[PDB]
Subunit: 137 residues, 4 copies
């Protein structure tokens, strides 16, 4: 992983060696969001021949910390039911069981668990369900 | 879908199986915007070969809800006229007729619809027209 | 342009016709940064197989207008010098001339026009130069 | 590198030259985040068939400068231990030594350097260290 721009400075030695000129690098930067080399702090040529860009502070976008937004819960959703069939492994991974499903089926007026095309569990959300009815609509 | 980073931890067992080392993963995370493993809550090795990154809260970017921005209408534009010809089904999608177009043509000094290279309808925007004369003017 | 999610709703007839099931869609959405289908208002299967994603308002990112930042000028920079030689076409497109260039080279202690490896113009701004010197230091 | 949209205006002569129609351009813009042509100030048809997009001021995302977040420091992490073996060059680049390393080991309750699968030095963070024992968990 060679560094083609270090601390805002074009590194001509490794550009030659990695066989990329200016026109090519400029084009690779624009596909990553940086429209001039003046806005770039770090640029790294990768294995697959892609460029990774760390923009200079002033041109970067603000993170959650920078805007003092309180640290929030970040979690993946879990697919409980797919195509009318309950997914086995995903029940215990979400720490739920078939009792919880049927209680939540009745909470949204659903009759069997094969009436449901798709259902997903999210930590900070109600249970999401797409019925076979809802999918013709 | 194999999880190569779970709750901030390198899953070394799934990295051996999928044949990706540390230096490959870091490169892959860089391409998705994360410049250190320490900034990643979740990384998912997709079946097409790429990784998908969920960053830790502190290194993610604020959403509209986080900045208490009001819920906007989110909708797609619809092409009404393309290459001089009015599109059939796209008028109905817009909830609009050929009557409405000619009134809006007169709103931008346009005689016929065949003087129009491109016309686009959007829910929260005035109608957008590019004439054939505008195509050559630029 | 196939609309695979419309107004938050999974369009099951369109997915089946385009030969993508729920796990594949999810994976494609994640590549576009959306980690759950509940966070998506529109998803569009492009002709080259990629999925374009419009997040629901609350999960999308603030624009400049949303943050009530006043409109600023947006302008592409133009490369005027590459590898010692001044590009002829890029001079008359940006607006400037060689009279302007050589005056600007005098501003930064540059002697001849062949001393410069890279120079870019930005609007009404101070000209950016990278001399052959700086490249190896 | 061809400019297909300049100052919000489609360049139809350039589009016909490059053999791209409206539909094809729109799809390209959608993959770059732009969901209408009206939100684009500049679009650049790039050498490898991708499009680069500068959105109009109102539709672009705010930078740190726009938000008056002060200039924070931008840097890359440096890996110090990988697969049990300490990287030679990486200690010198980070401005530390095995003297500093082994004192950091005792701060994190690890005895020898071979117990560590991965360790990275970040300029504005405490030393990251992943032992085999929490590799096993």
């Amino acid at each position: 992983p060679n560094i083609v721009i270090r601390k805002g400075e074009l590194q001509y030695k490794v550009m030659k060696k990695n066989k990329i000129d200016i026109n090519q690098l400029q084009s690779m930067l624009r596909q990553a969001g940086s429209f001039s080399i003046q806005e770039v702090e770090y640029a790294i040529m990768e294995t697959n021949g892609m460029v990774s860009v760390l923009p200079k502070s002033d041109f970067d976008k603000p993170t959650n910390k920078d805007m003092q937004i309180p640290s929030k819960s970040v979690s993946l959703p879990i697919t409980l039911i797919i195509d009318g069939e309950i997914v086995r492994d995903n029940l215990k991974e979400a720490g739920v069981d078939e009792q919880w499903l049927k209680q939540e089926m009745k909470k949204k007026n659903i009759d069997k668990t094969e009436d449901v095309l798709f259902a997903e569990w999210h930590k900070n959300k109600p249970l999401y369900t797409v019925t076979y009815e809802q999918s013709r609509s």
